[model samples]
Target: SGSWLRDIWDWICEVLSDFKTWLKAKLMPQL
Candidate 1:
C-alpha cells in the first residue's frame, strides 16, 4: 500500500496557521 500526502497536508495546515498570523500582522498596519 502507498501512503497518501497526509503528511504534506498536515504541514500545510501548520504553516497556514502561521501564514494567517503573518498576513494579519503585515496587512493590519497597512489597512
Candidate 2:
C-alpha cells in the first residue's frame, strides 16, 4: 500500500535547514 507523504514531513523538517523558509510551504504541499 502507498503511504501519505505527509508522514515523512516531520522527518524532512528535522533534516531540512529551511524550517522558517519552507516549513509551511512543504508541509502543506503533501496530502
Candidate 3:
C-alpha cells in the first residue's frame, strides 16, 4: 500500500518530530 515517497515521508516526519522537540526545548515561548 506504500510507495517510495511514502517511506521518505515517514522518515521526514520522524526527523520533523525530532526537530520540533528540539525547537520546543531550545526556542522561546513566542516561537
Candidate 4:
C-alpha cells in the first residue's frame, strides 16, 4: 500500500541520516 511505502521511506531517510552523521564522525579524524 502507498502508506506502507511512505513509512518505509521515512524510516530509510532517518536511518541514512543517522548513518551519515556517524560515518562523518568516524572518518573526519582519520582524514
Question: Which residue segments of model 3 deviate by more than 4 Å?
Answer: 24-31
Model 2, global lDDT: 0.74
TM-score of 4: 0.53
Off by over 4 Å in 4: 28-31
Pick by lDDT: 1 or 4, better one: 4
lDDT of 2 by residue, 1-31 (tens): 6667877987787768677667777768657
lDDT by residue (1-29, candidate 1, tens digit) is 55468878889998999999988898886
lDDT of 4: 0.88
The better-scoring model by lDDT among 3 and 4 is 4
- Tell me the TM-score of each prediction against the true structure: 0.54, 0.30, 0.49, 0.53
Which candidate has the highest TM-score of all? 1
- The stretch of ten residues in a row with the least summed lDDT in candidate 2 is 21-30
Candidate lDDT values, in order: 0.85, 0.74, 0.87, 0.88
Off by over 4 Å in 1: 1-4, 28-31
Q: Candidate 3 residues 1-31, lDDT tens each?
A: 6599888989998999999999878876754
| Native RMSD of candidate 1 (Å) | 3.3
